[PDB]
Amino acid sequence: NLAPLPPHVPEHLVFDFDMYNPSNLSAGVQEAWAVLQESNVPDLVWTRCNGGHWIATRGQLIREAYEDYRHFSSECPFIPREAGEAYDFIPTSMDPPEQRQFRALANQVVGMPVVDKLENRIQELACSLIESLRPQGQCNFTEDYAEPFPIRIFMLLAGLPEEDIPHLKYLTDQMTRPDGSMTFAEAKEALYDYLIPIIEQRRQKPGTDAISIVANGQVNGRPITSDEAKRMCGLLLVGGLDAVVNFLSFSMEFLAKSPEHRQELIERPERIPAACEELLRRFSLVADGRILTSDYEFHGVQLKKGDQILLPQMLSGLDERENACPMHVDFSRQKVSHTTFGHGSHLCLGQHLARREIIVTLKEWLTRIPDFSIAPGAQIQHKSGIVSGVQALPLVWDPATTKAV
Ligand code: HEM
Ligand SMILES: CC1(C)[C@@H]2CC[C@@]1(C)C(=O)C2
């Protein structure tokens, strides 16, 4: 389902990429996207898929577009248009300077200090989950760890029932990797139906949870509205539940296939942070965009006010102009250059929490289960979308090779 080429689009700039169903997906998700950086591909193309839109392909252009909020607005950040249109999360669908008051609050909730307060639980949860796993000599890493680990820490933070996971997870998944089971607007509603009562109650009877704090905060002198709180909260949920979950699956899948990498981390633990940065770069997974506010000639191409443009955050670090031998995992690159957590005024506030969770997992897994691999005959499937994922990650290990701690 290709849309008719709009008039302003030079036919030599056409490249029919389907962000929801790229071609050599069998080859891995990052690889599937990297066709975009083949020499036959112009730096800025128009795809007729998903209703027609621009995609920037080069770290250079992505960052530039990301910095440029005057021309490239966050109002409608998702493709397809119906979704960017329905999209109303705060701070994400706002541009500076308005964005700034809301970010400041959200930061109150997710930033450094919060991570520092939660570290012991993060550590406790990981060790517990791994240890519980260890003696079985096999899991479903996606279901067995990658989901519970990040989600439960989130639910704790948020003050929500663990019993709510499956529902929320489903709704979260519909937004980033649409099934076709529900439209974006429907999904957003259902999450909103969830959130409202909860907000209501936290305004009256505040607690110490993230939800309570958002519901009762101040923005540019006055009190947040219930609608604004609904709108930030809905973001925190999506932010918290999807990305870390999938990221661990990519990284875990790579580690399961690279003994030499696992060993490096075991012997030279001082390298974890650097490795973490390296995996963030190679296993980058987020792809969203911006809307043209006006007619704009950007790097010789004429964009029309109203045109959407995908600026894949995933793409910067995979770009050979940015990183030599991009597809190669190297824990000792002089410079890990990426925009995994974005760029510009919208850079991830959850970055600190994300990293803490990555590092703990690496350290804690490698400790108890140093040697593991992908199950004989499992075909690992990747899914593409706003956040790309891994469907299932069947692992096998010999328990006699494990160490209880
Ligand atoms: C590996 C993990 C993650 C990755 C790769 C990631 C990626 C991103 C990206 C690319 C953006 C910028 C979006 C834009 O410019 O349109 C962003 C923003 C944001 N993410 Fe993260 N995310 C991750 C985890 C988290 C976590 C754990 C949280 C906290 C619950 C979270 C909360 C946020 C928030 C609040 C924003 C928006 C901030 C603003 O608009 O100023 N994210 N994320
Ligand atoms: C692109 C994102 C990863 C960022 C946090 C959750 C997400 C889906 C958004 O709506 C903004």
| Ligand 1: centre distance to CA 373 (Å) | 30
Question: Cβ of 342: how many Cβ atoms within 10 Å?
Answer: 18
Token readout for 117 is 């307060």
Distance CA 299, CA 308 (A): 16
User: Distances in Å between the alpha carbon of 191 and those of 35, 103, 164?
Assistant: 35, 21, 11
3-state secondary structure of 293: coil
Residue closest via CA to ligand 1's atom 20 equals 348
Distance of alpha carbon 283 from alpha carbon 301, whole angstroms:
30
Token couple for 258: 């690279």
CA 343 – CA 308 distance, rounded (Å): 18
| Matching residue, tokens 């000792």 | 332
Residue 181: exposure state from Cβ atoms within 10 A (0-12, 13-18, ≥19): exposed
Q: Which of 359, 192, 200, 204 is nearest to 275 (CA)?
A: 359
**Cis (ω within 30 of 0) for the bond into 312?**
no
CB contact set of 209 (below 8 Å; sequence gap of 6+): 157, 158, 159, 202
- Would you list the DSSP string of 181-235? SS-HHHHHHHHHHHHHHHHHHHHHS--SSHHHHHHT-EETTEEPPHHHHHHHHHH
Q: What are phi and psi of 63, to 5 degrees?
A: -60, -45
Extract the annotated binding site. 348
Total domains in the fold of the chain: 1
Of the candidates 260, 251, 257, 268, which has an alpha carbon nearest to the alpha carbon of residue 373? Answer: 257
From the CA of 109, the nearest ligand is: 1
**Quick check: helix, strand or coil at residue 16?**
coil
CATH at 177: 1.10.630.10
Rounded-to-integer distance, Cα 270 and Cα 250, Å:
22
Of the bound ligands, which one is closest to the alpha carbon of residue 88? 2
Print the domain residue range for 154. Answer: 1-405
Which residue owns the Cα nearest ligand 2 atom 7? 239
- Separation CA 242–CA 255 (nearest Å): 21
User: Which residues are CB-neighbours of 283 under 8 A, at least 6 positions away?
Assistant: 30, 247, 250, 251, 254
Resolution of the determined structure in angstroms stands at: 2.1
State the number of CA atoms in the 13 A half-sphere of 296 facing the CB: 19
SS3 55: strand
Report the separation in Å between the CA atom of 371 and the middle of ligand 2, taken as the mean of its atom positions: 34
Instruction: Verify whether ligand 2 is closer than 6 Å to residue 288 (CB atom).
Output: yes
Measure the CA–CA gap between 302 and 311, rounded to whole angstroms: 16
Ligand 1 proximity of 160 Cβ (cutoff 6 Å): no
**Which pair of structure tokens corresponds to residue 167?**
């529902």
CA-angle at 256, arms to 259 and 36, nearest 5°: 105
- Nearest residue (by CA) to ligand 2, atom 11, is 92
Residue 300 one-letter amino acid? G
SS3 content of the chain, % helix, strand, coil (to 5): 50, 10, 40
- In this structure, are residues 281 and 340 in contact, taking their beta carbons and an 8 Å threshold? yes
